[PDB]
Every structure is written in structure tokens, then in C-alpha cells.
Design a protein around this ligand. Structure first.
Ligand SMILES: CC[C@H]1OC(=O)[C@H](C)[C@@H](OC(=O)N2CCC[C@@H]2c2cccnc2)[C@H](C)[C@@H](O[C@@H]2O[C@H](C)C[C@H](N(C)C)[C@H]2O)[C@](C)(OC)C[C@@H](C)C(=O)[C@H](C)[C@H]2NC(=O)O[C@@]21C
Ligand SMILES: [Mg+2]
Ligand SMILES: [Mg+2]
Ligand SMILES: [Mg+2]
Ligand SMILES: [Mg+2]
Ligand SMILES: [Mg+2]
Ligand SMILES: [Mg+2]
Ligand SMILES: [Mg+2]
Ligand SMILES: [Mg+2]
Ligand SMILES: [Mg+2]
Ligand SMILES: [Mg+2]
Ligand SMILES: [Mg+2]
Lengths: 240, 58
RNA sequence: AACGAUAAAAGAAGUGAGAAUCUUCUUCGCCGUAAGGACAAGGGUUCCUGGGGAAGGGUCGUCCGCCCAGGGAAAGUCGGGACCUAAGGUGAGGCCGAACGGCGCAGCCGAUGGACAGCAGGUCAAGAUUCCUGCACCGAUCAUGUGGAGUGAUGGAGGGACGCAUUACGCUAUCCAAUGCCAAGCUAUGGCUAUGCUGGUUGGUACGCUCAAGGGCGAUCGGGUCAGAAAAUCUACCGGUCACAUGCCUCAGACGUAUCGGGAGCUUCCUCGGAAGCGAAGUUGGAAACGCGACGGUGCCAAGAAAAGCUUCUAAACGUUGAAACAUGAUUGCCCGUACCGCAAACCGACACAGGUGUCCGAGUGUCAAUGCACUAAGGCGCGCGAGAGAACCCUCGUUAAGGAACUUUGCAAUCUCACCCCGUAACUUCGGAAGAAGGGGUCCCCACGCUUCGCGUGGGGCGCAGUGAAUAGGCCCAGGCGACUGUUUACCAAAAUCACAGCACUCUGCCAACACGAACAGUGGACGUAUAGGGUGUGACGCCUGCCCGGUGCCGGAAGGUCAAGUGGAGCGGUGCAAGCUGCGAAAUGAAGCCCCGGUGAACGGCUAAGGUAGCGAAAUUCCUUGUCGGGUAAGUUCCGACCUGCACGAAAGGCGUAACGAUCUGGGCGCUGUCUCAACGAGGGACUCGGUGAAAUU
RNA sequence: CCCCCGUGACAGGGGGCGGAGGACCGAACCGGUGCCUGCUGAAACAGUCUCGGAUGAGUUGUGUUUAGGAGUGAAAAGCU
RNA sequence: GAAACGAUGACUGAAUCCGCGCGGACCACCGCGCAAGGCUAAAUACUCCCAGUGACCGAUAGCGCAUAGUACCGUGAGGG
RNA sequence: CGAGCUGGAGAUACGCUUUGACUCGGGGAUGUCCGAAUGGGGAAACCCACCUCGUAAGAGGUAUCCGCAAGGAUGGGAACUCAGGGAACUGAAACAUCUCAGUACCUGAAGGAGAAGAAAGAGAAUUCGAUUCCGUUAGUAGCGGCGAGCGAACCCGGAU
């Protein structure tokens, strides 16, 4: 609703359908969100209003800084219009404050967590997601991620106080095909409804199934798709 | 295809025999009692336009 | 055989070697939300004139969209360009790649979008918002005066700038009425004598103490640098002062005066028919847009392009002695498009083809409404063979005694029903529905009385067989299977019980995500998303639910050990030379993921040896035997419903059972009606037959 | 949203008023259900009649993108 | 293959003339030769074009063409 | 060259030519716009510019890659040449190593030719004396699911 960009639809890369499905949609505009917040250290901002944001799930908050620079931030669960928000290491454990993990107390619930100092927020961004802090190790802090995974994130990285907005994606029951169309194209086309050519679940005489695999080769219910990577050392306890 | 079709070419003989009735019968031409050009029985003489008196122009 | 829609055609006059077919006149009939009119695309001279008459034209041509020659097309303002950007394309530098090449920031290209100055008329044989007449507007260079000092970027900001539904007030285009006005005459068949009949009844511009709904708006001073790269007098933010109504600003449109125009028709000339000259009236009442006022109001979630033009700021620069802005004169006005066809005989369809083709306008009367239906304006057309006949048969129709489904695979087909108003309406239910359930009544004309109209209600009266009097115009019900539902599909034999679906589950994925495209340590999709997210796979609304088996296979997990590759390691055996040396093969032990081995795992592949079916269903879209058996309905029931269980060979997310509503779905029954039938008849039109014209085919 | 009536464990029920919907009927438009016709066609897939959708998962113009073991596919081995 | 020799993608890596490479694993002897820099005419090949000739053709032959890559077909490549 | 010419053109009109037309042989001079295409754009043959000289007409320039600069490169060639990349049908009476074949095709670079070339060689006479080509050795030697089948070189003769 205030100084945004044009998000143009596209589901194919260099030419080909690369992410299966994906189509319809109500033609949305892009709102730039301050995911990092570092440069606004020390400066206080007023919550002008909580706006609607397609592209997200998390409600959007319009910040009116004292220096008159306007920015958008993911609205946390609780933040009301006419409240103050401050960025920088100097920050209270109050809603919407941006403060690095070292200054963040243990047992605290956070969202919009970084991964590398800078870049911007990368974890717990969608509505109702929380990061439970477990307690410091060195430069690194052990954190509980929305999945249940415990990661070693260095205290040098920012976070925002509280859980994400838009309360609950529950009473949202879609309703009918076509509600799903206001967003993404004729969903999941069963490979069992396909032909031998098209997919491995193709063919046979009637309704069936025989070895359980995806579109291309592989296998689908249980198969560690994660690789033998370096980011593994900075990670302790995964599953559930 | 084109369902009933001829089985063999009809010979020059057979084709011609069928045409033994195709000959036109010459009109029975009468001579006009006036203008003296020939005419058709029960019709106005073409030439004078007569049929006892003169009916049609010329 | 056919001559390309069953929208007709008739006569007269003309022309000509020649006339059903060409011209002209008077009729007739067909379209009229089109079969009229205006673009766009596309075609290319098809346009107009004068000629022609081989071939093309399903016949014939004297004619033509054909053939020949000549002509016709006019823009500062309309489209496009010299302006802007979207998807996309390209792209110095740059990132990748046997080559050829692939990517890619800015930038540039790119309308289907933004931006931007002109209207009313006239008329060539053929152009017109282009020419011409009238009176406007836009920008540029200069001149003369006003004016007296800034002007303000390649960068800042504002602004351009955007949805869907619904809706209040005002108006216009436009349309109706009349004993309003103006103009022309005449009518007679019985009447009217005009209060009858026909026709016309205001477009642009300028000004106006005239009316006017609606619509748009804050103005200023100051503070903080931490914001717009910097600067800013511009913008944002915070604070202070006047921010009710109002108050300013804007007039859609109306009215009036003027003026240019047009206007029914009249007037003369007439070389077969056009040119020229003249010109009346301009009322009142009603309706009324998808247009205008306008960026209005409200509601809603799926949250509704960019960039330039523009408006406001300073930077640098020139200048403050000739600034910007205004006003009036002159000058200036580039390139491409413009004919014609354009729902079609000029485009795509091999043809002058019953198809297909994006946008706009699209009058009247009647009918709740309407772009529906009938008729009809304006306009366009009778579909490029014709004429007889009145057989069989075939096509498209009308009626039909008595019967009424007996037809048949099957009421397939074809009737019945049919609009609006009033009464009335079931089981069953997800309480919305089912419902237009079912059923019944009304409907026209005149008069009088009442009111809320365009019209309606009550009373009485009239006419016909009949009053949605013609056209448009649901047959309904009971029970079942399947699928919840709207939707999607096999262009061209399958529309469905297929696929999809909202919902549910398993599962993977921690972000340079999994996964995907790719020559690639490129790049991109996933995603400018981040586990309330994304990939995959299955089931398929909702309700109650989803059991037993982990032996085999797969997946996740452990590791006491066995098995295992290159390599490290070289014990030994062997060649040759006189000899050091040079050389050929080579064990043990060590050496990874894997596999054997152990545990787990079913909304994993599966099963009913690892176990032998929990509910629920069952002769079923599943049952062989089979027309199972008993009951229902029928005069009679291989199908159908219901029970029963002996399930050849049901069964729980390859979901099990049930479920209101939905269905051009499939099965069985009933009412209604009927030419489906007993059993066919009569009648109509179009072929078939006959003549004149033109004249194919497969086959042999 | 505004007036009204209800309290046994209940829920709402009524009046106004609003104007929702992969709601209904129906043109245009998209479509192709059943019959006949056509079957050397008017037509290399059509016609009359009947029928489905008709504010949506809608229809349509331009402009542009993806193709050959490749594309696309509300999935027929369909379309290219 | 007993597979020498050339060649090189990955890893390594020497000698310098009592020196190096070769001689079909490999050794010794005998013998042939100097890599890790570059150029180099002629003999060879082909025929768009030009001339000459022919137990080559003479209009369905011969070039696709007595001339046309035209007419015609196709969106195009192409075909003709 | 020495009288005709005015293209095919079967065609009339106007003319030209012994002060040597016409034609032929050899040079020049003009050569619109497109095309490597090259100022910028572009849907080839069209739009739109700027800079220098100039009285307007009009003339010249404005692409990237090499190098100081002179000067060179882009693009086109029927087949032939070398290079990078490289099929399958087919044979094997099936097929998989093998064959077809390093053929066809694509791509690069170039010329009238190219390629190759001046022995760390051939090779067994202590012969030879750069390369290419032709005959020959020779279907020998050999390779080979030792199958289908594939197939050298030295000597010698010869072109140069
Ligand atoms: C409608 C016209 C259309 O014909 C049909 O479609 C009918 C219906 C079809 O019938 C059919 O295909 N069928 C399928 C079965 C029912 C129907 C049929 C069969 C026989 C007679 N009548 C009808 C044929 C009779 C059939 O022949 C039949 O083929 C059978 C394979 C064998 C028969 N033999 C035994 C005599 C033969 O007649 C064929 C294969 O066609 C499609 C014939 C071939 C020659 C063909 O392609 C024609 C050019 C064909 N295509 C076209 O455009 O026009 C045609 C003539
Ligand atoms: Mg780009
Ligand atoms: Mg007739
Ligand atoms: Mg008779
Ligand atoms: Mg049942
Ligand atoms: Mg269904
Ligand atoms: Mg449906
Ligand atoms: Mg005849
Ligand atoms: Mg209907
Ligand atoms: Mg219906
Ligand atoms: Mg001859
Ligand atoms: Mg030729």
C-alpha cells in the first residue's frame, strides 16, 4: 500500500516447467521487507499500521522511524498500532525489538533469525513460527528451530522478540478448488492416473500401485535427501 | 467407397444400342397463310405475327 | 448424379447479332442485436469512369469482384514514428562452455498498456477529424512591449499509480406522446373535410449579476540529522498554531442572447436526368444508458504493472547591464498509414464453399424485463440454372377414428407440460435445501368505483370452441448403483462410474533447502519464499470408523564379527650380464561405502508359509454353479427391490459402510400424453419423373 | 448492521435492511448431450432440432515463451 | 595380448656426450640416430568457370529447365 | 575495325555516323538503398541521429577485434585440404566385442591447392639418406567373438 515493487508470475526457468504445477493467482505486488535491520541501530520507530501482505502468511507492520524513513517488518504476535520498536544491541525483551542473540536472554522466544551476520532474516518467518533459545556455547548459541532441530547459530546474528503474526492458518479451510486457484494451478496430478510413459506409477488395468517412487527415478516415503555437507558441524539433533 | 459401381466397360455396340431412341423428331412445319415463312401448328407465325389477323408486332 | 440452404417472384419498358438471367419502372417476398452500419486483422487496385465479351462465372450474359486502358488515395492536431515502459528480446564490461555456442547488471529494443494539440459543415464519377468554407487549438525560432531579476539537472521527492461485486444523486446521447409549432396538398371506396392524413421539429462556437446535482481540497511556522548519495527553500517524521458544518476551487449539463451551419421541402434548367439557387418551424410533457459528472459511496479478499510527460527541489554551470513568466504580431508545421472488401463472393478454408474470424454502433410497436420472441423503420437482400408435372420411394413437416407402450435392446423418437400472478406443497436433510416439489385456480374486451405508476384492485356487463387467443415457452413422480458437490477429458465414433477437487495422511526438505532444467564450480526455477514453508506419493466433501501379519522386498537405525576395490606394504619365485646393476610376476597384514547379520517400520510394496478377516458389507459395476432361494411389484418379472449367507474369487486411506444436495451418468417402476405400435391414412413442401441449358464419379 | 422475543445444559426465533454466491433461469459468448440428416458432403467432422455452462477452476484479442525421447497435458499415450 | 613405440587427461618427474633415445616384454652385446624451436617450391587432389573432342543424348532422351529453380505446392525447412 | 548503327524485340517515331559511329580488346570515372554491413535502431532494402567542411544543394566521418603507427581481421566460395566433434541402418543370416567407419553429418581454419617435410627415422645390407604421389611387394606379414571379416611396411621400378 506504500512504495512497493512488481512481482511478476513465472513457474518455468530458462524455458521449461521446472517446479511442477504453479499457475493461477490474483496478480500480486511485492512489498520490500527489512529482514536485516542492522543499519537502523539505535533509532526508534513507531508502528504506523499492520497491513495485509500477499507473498507471505505473516502480517506486515509499517514502521515509521523518527528520521522519517519508512520500512516494513514482519508483524509479531502481539504488536499493536502506536507502539515503539528499536534496533541495535541496546534493546529490551519487548515485542518487535531487533537485538543480537548474545544480548538475548535464554528461554526467550524469537522469529526472523539470521544465519550469517547480515544477509537478512532466514529462519521462522511464516505466521506463528518460533525459535526457542537454549543457551550460549562460545560465539555460538544453541537454538530450537520451528521443525524441532537444534542449531548452532552464532550470537553475532540478530533476532526479533516473540512469535510470528497472522495467528493461525487453521480456520482457513480453503473450501473449494479454485480457492486453491486464487493461488496455485491444478494441484497434485496423481502419477497413478498417468501412463507408463509419463510416470512410474503409470498404467495397469484400473486403480493400483507397486514399489512407491517420485516423478523422475528415486523413492519417496523415507530417504535422506540431505547431502554430506559442511553445515552439518554447526547442527546438533535433527529429526522431529 | 462409391457403393454400386459398373463391373465391365460397356462396349461400343451396347452403348450405341441404348441410344437407338435418342433421335430428335423434326418439328411438323406448316407454311403461313400470309407472310409465307414457315410456322408451328397452333402458334402465331413468327414472321408477320399473324394468327387469322395480326396479333404480335412484326 | 448434380448445378451448393425451400428468403419467393411477377409483369411492363429499354438495350442488343442475340435477353428467364443486363438496365429502368411498379409491385411482391426475406433479414432487420442483421442478412443494416463503423473499425481492426488480413487481402492488394478488387474502388471509380469508358470500353470488352476468349476463358473464369456450376445455366445464360449485352453483365461482373473477370479482361484492357485512364483516373482515384491529400493530415501540425486521427493511428504509428522522431516519447515511455510490461512480458519477452538483446546486451559493452562480466560469468560459463570440445567447437558452433549458452547465460547476464545497467542500458537498449519491444504495445496488447501510459502520454499528448480540432471541432461543425460542404462535396469528385471515385478521398475526407486529411481537401474547401467558417471559427478554434498545440509546440518551436525570432520580433515588439509588459516585466524587472534568476534560470532551475543525466540526480531528490510528489504525481502518474490501476482490483472485484454492489449502489445514491444529477445529467446527456437517444427514444415516445400531443388538438404545441411549421410546411405541403389531397381527399372520394359507406363515413371524416379536420381536432383527419404525411413529413420536419437544433448541431458547433463566443459571451452571459441565469439555474445546477455532483465532484477535488488543508494553509502556515518550527525542530531533530539518525532519512531521501551530497545539497535543498522540495519530501518524509515529531511538535505548535486555525483544521465541526462551513469554507474555498471546479462546472457534467441546462437556460438565454448572438452567430456560423443545417433543416422538411419549394424554385428554375434539363443534353433521360443530375446540377444550381432559396429555406419554415424549433413547444410542452414523459423515458433514459454499459457514456459524462467523477479518482463518488459502501462492501469484500484472492489484495489489484512500469516507465516517461508532468508538478515541486537544490548541485554544477552561465547570468544578476539584455532573467523567468505573460500578451500580441509574423514565421514554421518532417516521415509512414488513409482507395476498396472487411461475420465476407474481396480475409483463413483448393472453390463466387451452409464452416471459422477480435472490437464498436445496432431504431419502433407489442410483450414484468431484455440485445428474448413476433412484425416492421433506416438500410440490405430474393442466396448466378430454368420451366413443367403432381408416380413409386426418400427427406422436412400438418392432422388423425378407436385403442394408449401393446413398439422395442431401451418410450429411441415424437407428443403432452410450457410465460406471469394467486392459492398450495411430501418423505428426507449437512436445517441452506429438497421446491417450479406434487397439485389447483386465474389471464381477453367495455364500463363505473379506488390507488403507488409504465400499471394494479374491487364491482357489474360483453363476446368466441378457445383470452401468455399468434411466436418465444419445465412433462412430473417413486426407488436403486456409482461418483459428494461446480468443474475436466479422448480436435475428428467413448463426457463417464475417467481425471481434478476442498479435505485427510505418510514422507522428505534448515536454506548455495530438498527437488527440477542445463555443455556448466555458468545461470534459473523452487523463491525475492523459509517448516503455520516448499517437494513427492496416496486417498478424495461430510459422518461414524480404518482390524490382524514385520517371514520375503523396500526405507530408517545399530555394529560383536564375516565379505570387499584401488592404494600403502613388499616376504618369496624367475630372466639376463663376468659384475654392480637393469628387469618380469608376486603373497601376508593393512585399506571405504556396499552386501550377508540384528532390531524397527503397514494411510511402506504386499498377505489373510509371518499371520489366517476386527467392525461393516454381501447372489454385489465383485456370484462360476444361476434364471440360487423366499417375498415384493406384474395377468405373466433371466432384469429390478428386499431379505437370507453356500463370499468359485467383499472388506477398511489400491480406504470399509453410510449419507442430504448436485448428474445431458447408469438401472428398475409408476402417472400423464402420444402414429412407438395394432395399422396405417390423408394432406403439404423439397428431391425423384419430363423438357431446354451446362455435365461429373468410383469401376472397367 | 438496526428494533423484537426466548433461558429446562441448550441452540436461536421474528421484523426491517443489506446485497453474498466455483447460487438459480436465460441471450450474446464458450461447449457438444441425444436423434435424424449428410456419407463421390454445402463441409477432410457440418446442419436443423434438442441439450451443458453462462461472475467463474469464466470467455476472448493482440504481444511473447517452452518441441522431437523433446515440449505441453484438471491424464485420452491427448495435443505439438 | 608376451604389447614394444608414438600420443596425452590426472599425478610424478631425469640425464648432459667415459651423455640421451631407438631397434616389438625384458637383459647384455652389436648396430641405427641426436627429440623437447620455426619456415620451405615441385610431383598430388578437386572442378564454379573456359576451350577441344566423343562407336554420348537428340525433346518421356539429355541437366530439374532447348531454360525455370519459374509456374505450382508448403507456415517453414523444403519440394517442384 | 572500316559502314553502318539506334539491346533481346519479331515495334513505329526521333536521330546518330568517314571531324570515324556500332562492335570488339585494354584502362579510367560515376556506382541509389540493402547485405560482413560497420553511426544508432530495425520485422533486409527502411526509420532516427550527432560531428566536420559548406552559399543552399551536396561531400566526408562516427562498428568491434590487433597493434606506436603504417597496415591487417570480420563476410562469401561447387568440389578438393587439414583440424575439433562424430552416427545408425547394415554385415556378423539373432546380438553385445567386432563390422558399417572415423563413412555420413555438424563445426573451425585456409588456399589455388593444401597437407606433410629435412631422421632421437626406416631398418638387418655395419645398406638407406626430407616429404607427397603412382606401380609393386600383397591379400604376403599380421590382426580377428582367430568369427563375420579387416589388412600393412621394407626392398625394387617410376613422377618430382
Ligand atoms: C463412411 C465412409 C467410410 O466408410 C466407413 O466408415 C464404413 C462405416 C466402414 O465401416 C466400418 O469400418 N465398420 C466397422 C464394423 C461396422 C462397420 C461396417 C463394416 C462392414 C460393413 N458396413 C459397416 C467401412 C465399410 C470400412 O470397410 C470395412 O472394414 C472392415 C475392417 C471390413 C469390412 N469388410 C469385411 C467388408 C469393410 O467393409 C472401411 C475400413 O472404412 C472405415 C473401408 C475403407 C475402404 C475405407 O477407409 C473407406 C475409404 C472409408 N473411409 C472414408 O472416408 O470413407 C469410407 C468409405
Ligand atoms: Mg533481461
Ligand atoms: Mg423444379
Ligand atoms: Mg401430360
Ligand atoms: Mg442397493
Ligand atoms: Mg461426478
Ligand atoms: Mg458437471
Ligand atoms: Mg437435362
Ligand atoms: Mg434450453
Ligand atoms: Mg439446465
Ligand atoms: Mg518428337
Ligand atoms: Mg537453371
Amino acid at each position: 500500500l506504500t512504495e512497493a515493487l512488481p512481482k511478476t508470475g513465472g513457474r518455468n526457468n530458462r524455458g521449461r516447467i521446472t517446479s511442477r504445477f504453479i499457475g493461477g493467482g490474483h496478480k500480486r505486488l511485492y512489498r520490500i521487507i527489512d529482514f536485516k535491520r542492522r543499519d537502523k541501530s539505535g533509532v526508534n520507530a513507531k508502528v504506523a499500521a499492520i497491513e495485509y501482505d500477499p507473498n507471505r502468511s505473516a502480517r506486515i507492520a509499517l514502521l515509521h522511524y523518527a528520521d522519517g524513513e519508512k520500512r516494513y517488518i514482519l508483524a509479531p504476535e502481539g504488536l499493536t498500532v502506536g507502539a515503539t520498536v528499536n534496533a541495535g544491541p541496546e534493546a529490551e525483551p519487548k515485542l518487535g525489538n531487533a537485538l543480537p542473540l548474545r544480548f538475548v536472554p535464554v528461554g526467550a522466544v524469537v522469529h526472523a533469525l539470521e544465519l550469517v551476520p547480515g544477509k537478512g532474516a532466514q529462519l521462522a518467518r511464516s505466521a506463528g513460527t518460533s525459535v526457542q533459545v537454549q543457551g550460549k556455547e562460545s560465539d555460538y548459541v544453541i537454538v530450537r528451530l520451528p521443525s524441532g532441530e537444534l542449531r548452532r547459530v552464532h550470537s553475532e546474528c540478530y533476532a526479533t522478540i516473540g512469535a510470528v503474526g497472522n495467528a493461525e492458518h487453521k480456520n482457513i479451510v480453503l473450501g473449494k478448488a479454485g480457492r486453491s486457484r486464487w493461488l496455485g494451478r491444478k494441484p497434485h496430478q496423481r502419477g497413478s492416473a498417468m501412463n507408463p510413459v509419463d510416470h512410474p506409477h503409470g498404467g495397469g488395468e484400473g486403480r493400483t500401485g507397486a514399489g512407491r517412487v517420485p516423478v523422475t527415478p528415486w523413492g519417496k516415503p523415507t530417504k535422506g535427501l540431505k547431502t554430506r555437507r559442511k553445515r552439518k558441524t554447526s547442527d546438533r539433533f535433527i529429526v522431529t | 467407397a462409391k457403393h454400386p459401381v459398373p463391373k465391365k466397360k460397356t462396349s461400343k455396340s451396347k452403348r450405341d444400342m441404348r441410344r437407338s431412341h435418342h433421335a430428335l423428331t423434326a418439328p411438323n412445319l406448316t407454311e403461313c397463310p400470309q407472310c409465307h415463312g414457315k410456322k408451328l401448328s397452333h402458334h402465331i407465325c413468327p414472321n408477320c405475327g399473324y394468327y387469322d389477323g395480326r396479333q404480335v408486332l412484326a
